Amino acid sequence: AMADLEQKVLEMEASTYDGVFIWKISDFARKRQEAVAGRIPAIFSPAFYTSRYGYKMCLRIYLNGDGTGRGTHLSLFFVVMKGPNDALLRWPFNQKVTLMLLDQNNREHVIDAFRPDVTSSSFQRPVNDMNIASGCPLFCPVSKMEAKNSYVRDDAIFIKAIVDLTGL
Amino acid sequence: AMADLEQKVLEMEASTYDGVFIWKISDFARKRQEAVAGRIPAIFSPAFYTSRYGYKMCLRIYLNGDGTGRGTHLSLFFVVMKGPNDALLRWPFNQKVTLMLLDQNNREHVIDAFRPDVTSSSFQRPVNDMNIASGCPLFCPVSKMEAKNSYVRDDAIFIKAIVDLTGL
Amino acid sequence: AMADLEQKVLEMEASTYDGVFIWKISDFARKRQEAVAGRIPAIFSPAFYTSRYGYKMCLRIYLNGDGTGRGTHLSLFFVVMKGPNDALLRWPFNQKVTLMLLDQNNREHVIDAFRPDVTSSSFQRPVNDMNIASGCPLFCPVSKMEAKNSYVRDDAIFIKAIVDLTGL
Amino acid sequence: PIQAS
Amino acid sequence: PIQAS
């Protein structure tokens, strides 16, 4: 009831419709310690879209890493979600995805990118609320976060996603 | 009360501001039955706009037909609504309107375009919440959306409207 | 919580993300009398943005004037507010601002504009919720608000702001 | 620009 | 892209 509508409002506050998304993660130190302790291994971002009626997507982050990144890296993954208009879209999802951790001095961003593996279940038309997340287990070393740095400033970080819209 | 703000959130979720609107009608079979049985002959779409501060508009559908199409056709209508910025706009409303029923196999969409008759009360500056509707009583034969029709897929249909922006 | 949710929903209803904002001030005669009587000297507009993740801004109006305009002019000011992404933006704020009172016969708008004084605290990175407002105390003589005039119509006026986006 | 008083 | 575990 109340909580459902609250989630709807926050989702709508965060949504974008041009395939460009900036995720501000505040209270970074506590959330990272929550990951280190295993209490909250991962966090989902709000959803965003490639166009007004396009693909629905979100991000998933592990502040203390997943898989090969466990214990040493921030791991960051892309998620194709079940969207209201999926029946109108091309499948499999086949857009290049660029993911960054922003330097708040703007000098040296962390940036990674990939093209979808169209054979992977991660990029098929969703049958559940989300497909399996796919992306970069070795996205960013935890040491870059812990030492003197400009990625974490005022206890927040910014993650930016750019979904290329070629062909859409 | 709560229902008021639930309605407000739903309208905001569906609003567009570039004259292009896609209306997904789910639970198609149930709503068709409600229309055939006379309980809910018509449904209004959420509102959309020609621009951020432009005309306010919605659609009205009769899943079992209205007027000449009653009982034989889907009937689809366009509605000029009282908008918050009407005092800044030109009246009568004079933009081309294109309405479509989307084939979900990407086959022949049903498409009708019209230009407003500027002498009609449907297009004068609204005095009530909604002007009188205008559109196509014979938009699509009911028999054309049946088993293996491809307009209905997974119990949903998609209606698209495009309002031309020339001169705005 | 419903009060807080209502506020968020109203903010989102009014937000724009391209530096263009139109502020409809309804109940004009009552609000102007409230200003004349000193009970509510000033009104703040909803917030708007230069881009999806850009500067957060609002307007502040004195319907019976402030400073040199007090009692003889509408005074209209621009406010830089603390936005969620300020750490990503360039400071000081350096964008030209155009402010207008719209003629609802669209013949003679009131318009003023300024370049920010980049040495002023009004344009530094905000530490409080808003910076000190700055703008035009002599924006519009109150005589232009008379009934024979076409700025007030059906007990409402329209204010427009255009934040130039050069270099963003 | 002039600041609001 | 590598899938999450």
Numbering used by the authors:
A (entry chain A), B (entry chain C), C (entry chain B): 334 to 501
D (entry chain H), E (entry chain G): 204 to 208
Publication text:
ORF3a is a transmembrane protein capable of forming homodimers and potentially homotetramers. The TRAF proteins participate in multiple NF-κB signaling pathways, functioning as adaptor proteins and E3 ubiquitin ligases. They form trimers and interact with receptor intracellular domains and other proteins through their C-terminal TRAF-C domains. Since the putative TRAF-binding sequence in ORF3a is conserved between SARS-CoV (PLQAS) and SARS-CoV-2 (PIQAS), and generally conforms to the TRAF-binding consensus sequences, we hypothesized that SARS-CoV-2 ORF3a might also bind to TRAFs and thereby induce NF-κB activation.
We observed density for five residues (PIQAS) of the ORF3a peptide, which binds at a solvent-facing groove in the globular region of the TRAF-C domain. The TRAF-C binding sites are not fully occupied—in our model, each TRAF trimer has either one or two peptides bound, which is similar to previously reported TRAF:peptide complex structures. We also co-crystallized TRAF2 TRAF-C with an ORF3a peptide in which the isoleucine was replaced with selenomethionine and collected anomalous diffraction data. Of note, the side chain from Q38 in the peptide forms multiple hydrogen bonds with two serine residues in the TRAF-C domain.
